[PDB]
Amino acid sequence: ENLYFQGASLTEIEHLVQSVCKSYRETCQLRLEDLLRQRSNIFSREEVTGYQRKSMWEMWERCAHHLTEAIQYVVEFAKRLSGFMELCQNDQIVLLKAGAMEVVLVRMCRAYNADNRTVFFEGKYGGMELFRALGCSELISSIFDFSHSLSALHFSEDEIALYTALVLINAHRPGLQEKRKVEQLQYNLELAFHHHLCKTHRQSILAKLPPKGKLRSLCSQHVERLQIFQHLHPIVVQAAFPPLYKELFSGG
Template identity: 60%
Template sequence: MWQRCARRVTEAIERVVEFAKRLRGFLQLSQHDQIVLLKAGAMEVVLLRMCRAFDAASGTVLFEGKLAGPELFRSLGCPELVASVFDFARGLSALRCSESELALLSALLLLNAGRPWLQDRPRVARLQGQLDVLPAPGRLRALCSQHLEQVQAFRRLHPAGVSAAFPPLYRELFREEAEPAAGRGR
């Protein structure tokens, strides 16, 4: 199930990357800052966009072409994370955000000058300032941290499974900082 979810998340992250490339000024940032912003915000945007796949009437989410409830994800071994993600999707779905509103919120999540390790924070702040400023989405950050903790727990249980089973983009985005990045000096 982790492998199946990793593939779906990777597909969603690829769409987030394409969205980011279309944000005015994003491609003018250094490659380093683009990567920092994507690593920090991509999962937040994926969780945000999940509300479009959530069916409030049945409490299910569209997953691999079928409606699935939390019980399908039981084998992940992280029921609190699954419940939190479904609760978040339910709450966000109830807001009935338009595509424009979701796009604006997605842009705000991606162009966040408060992200650690940015090299040109003022430039990112200028891009961020071009958008309407909303309160910091702390719940998304908490869910992303919870997701990362569960990936790391899975990695400890199945160290070889992550390298063999997960798509390269997923492995790169959710690797531990102490791990060497693929293709960089080892």
């Protein structure tokens, strides 16, 4: 079926590095240089107050839509990732249901400016105060701190490519039918990320990477806050939340 479902040689692991990095460049949504250049474009006091005065449901709908836009690029990344399409449809759905949000949160660090603690949202950079109308402050500050700790690692685009590939191909996700096939794909992607870090003298970041439970805590926080919003405005979720967002975070 696929070469990376078996034990790969050094040269094949080298091909995998290049393959993962190509897949990511083609699906990274926004180019890094565009995000970096736009760092000077920050929302004014007036604009921040405008977002803060928006109704809770209005802000929830905008954030869910933007998050769905990013997730779509992650689905495209998985489709182009070596071996993912060779897995069964059950296992592809399992991996994306559990990992799409985690990949988006990793990818988000590119759009985060550590210097002034701002994130890129709807054309400009804004601090966490911009999201106050959502009424989920703990979760917003948890995403900002996570973006901050990743930003401190000074990830290259190639590093994000290889790390996110590994975030997606997790053989420990509950519900995987072909666990051994996934285990082997993960082991080769692991070798590819660690080979690239070795080749770029970047192995010092391995101990500095966040624990797996941290990304899981952020996804659990997001699902818990959505359920709270759902009880308050159920028809907002039912009529105006994107169908892909509902399929991943509420259950269809």
